[PDB]
Design an enzyme around this catalytic site. Sequence first.
Site, short mmCIF file in Angstrom:
data_model
loop_
_atom_site.label_atom_id
_atom_site.label_comp_id
_atom_site.label_asym_id
_atom_site.label_seq_id
_atom_site.Cartn_x
_atom_site.Cartn_y
_atom_site.Cartn_z
CG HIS A 164 31.10 3.13 -1.60
ND1 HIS A 164 31.35 4.49 -1.69
CD2 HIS A 164 30.75 2.89 -0.32
CE1 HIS A 164 31.16 5.04 -0.50
NE2 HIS A 164 30.80 4.09 0.35
CB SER B 297 28.89 6.54 1.27
OG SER B 297 30.26 6.70 1.57
CG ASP C 8 31.91 5.97 -4.77
OD1 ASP C 8 31.13 5.07 -5.14
OD2 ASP C 8 32.18 6.19 -3.57
C1 LIG Z 1 30.55 4.24 1.84
C2 LIG Z 1 30.50 5.52 2.73
O1 LIG Z 1 29.68 5.29 3.65
C3 LIG Z 1 31.95 5.86 3.07
C4 LIG Z 1 32.10 7.37 3.19
C5 LIG Z 1 33.36 7.76 3.90
C6 LIG Z 1 33.43 9.25 4.12
N1 LIG Z 1 34.45 9.58 5.11
C7 LIG Z 1 34.78 10.83 5.44
N2 LIG Z 1 35.71 11.04 6.37
N3 LIG Z 1 34.18 11.86 4.86
N4 LIG Z 1 32.96 5.35 2.13
C8 LIG Z 1 33.81 4.39 2.48
O2 LIG Z 1 33.80 3.86 3.59
C9 LIG Z 1 34.82 3.94 1.44
C10 LIG Z 1 34.36 2.63 0.78
C11 LIG Z 1 35.63 1.87 0.57
C12 LIG Z 1 36.40 2.15 1.85
N5 LIG Z 1 36.09 3.57 2.08
C13 LIG Z 1 36.84 4.48 2.72
O3 LIG Z 1 36.51 5.67 2.79
C14 LIG Z 1 38.14 3.99 3.36
N6 LIG Z 1 38.21 4.40 4.80
C15 LIG Z 1 39.32 4.57 2.58
C16 LIG Z 1 39.35 4.17 1.14
C17 LIG Z 1 39.33 2.82 0.77
C18 LIG Z 1 39.35 2.44 -0.57
C19 LIG Z 1 39.40 3.41 -1.56
C20 LIG Z 1 39.41 4.76 -1.22
C21 LIG Z 1 39.39 5.13 0.13
#
Ligand SMILES: *C[C@@](*)(O)[C@H](CCCNC(N)=[NH2+])NC(=O)[C@@H]1CCCN1C(=O)[C@H](N)Cc1ccccc1
EC number: 3.4.21.5
Lengths: 40, 243
Positions: B43, B191, B93
């Site tokens: 992602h 991420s 992912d």
């Molecule tokens: C892309 C990264 O920067 C991020 C990591 C998030 C980690 N969070 C914690 N608390 N450790 N990922 C995201 O932001 C991903 C991408 C799609 C949206 N997303 C989310 O985490 C959403 N808040 C929830 C989610 C949405 C869609 C599918 C699964 C989870």
Amino acid sequence: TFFNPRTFGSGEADCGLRPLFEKKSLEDKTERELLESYID
Amino acid sequence: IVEGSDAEIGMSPWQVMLFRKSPQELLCGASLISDRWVLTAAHCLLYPPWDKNFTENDLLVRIGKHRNIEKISMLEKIYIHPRYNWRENLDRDIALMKLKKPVAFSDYIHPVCLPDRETAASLLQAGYKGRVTGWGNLKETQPSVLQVVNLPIVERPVCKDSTRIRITDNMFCAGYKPDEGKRGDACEPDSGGPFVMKSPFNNRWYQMGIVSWGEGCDRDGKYGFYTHVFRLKKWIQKVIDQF
Ligand SMILES: *C[C@@](*)(O)[C@H](CCCNC(N)=[NH2+])NC(=O)[C@@H]1CCCN1C(=O)[C@H](N)Cc1ccccc1
Ligand SMILES: *[C@@H]1O[C@H](CO)[C@@H](O)[C@H](O)[C@H]1NC(C)=O
Ligand code: NA
Ligand SMILES: [Zn+2]
Ligand SMILES: [Zn+2]
Ligand SMILES: [Zn+2]
């Protein structure tokens, strides 16, 4: 090994040992927490 | 990284920073697994809703020490898992990026190990702690130095009960339970960053996961989700041994 050295490049044999820590026999400030988590 | 601590110099030499080329923008974390291959979350490179569909020529990575011997490398090619499910739950992912030219290992640049069968079955157990690193948000909405936090892997049943999002065998979650006392979590844009564990056996650090998703950051009763690297090692092989 798992990867051919020719596609993968240098690294599968030289991995996970930090020059400034494991290689100098120095512990970083929090890795003991990880070790402690293994011990029951 | 929320509720984390400053990282020591050379503490995470496999740390990689993914940057948008034009305009220059820190996009995600990543990890060095060899002198020419970098692992990250899919992602970070492909997520249409956030208008992310990068070409190798749109990105740059930075490795090594944080304004002189730092390493800036261009990308030769990007590989996204063919079954990455961005429309649903971010299943698989994971992405691979090949550097245009291999980088030289140094005191500040070295690859992290990828786990093998025996390692992932000895260390990938609930209760055991791993380490996550990043330059992401310090609080739900940025650091001047790389942040770090060690977190325990959480039993699957607890992970599934903490969210309505469908969890797959290609993910695992970690973080402290509401009453364990301690806190900590990754946060956007951590991420792509690595969740590593130090093997007490050979003293080597192995990457068990990739920061993938979460709801909020460091909230009670919720946990961070990570791509299960070992479960997808076969794809990593196909891509690396393929090309
Ligand atoms: C892309 C990264 O920067 C991020 C990591 C998030 C980690 N969070 C914690 N608390 N450790 N990922 C995201 O932001 C991903 C991408 C799609 C949206 N997303 C989310 O985490 C959403 N808040 C929830 C989610 C949405 C869609 C599918 C699964 C989870
Ligand atoms: C990525 O952008 C390419 C066009 O340049 C497009 O063919 C591909 O379908 C995009 N990937 C998607 C939207 O999943
Ligand atoms: Na939490
Ligand atoms: Zn070396
Ligand atoms: Zn400080
Ligand atoms: Zn849309």
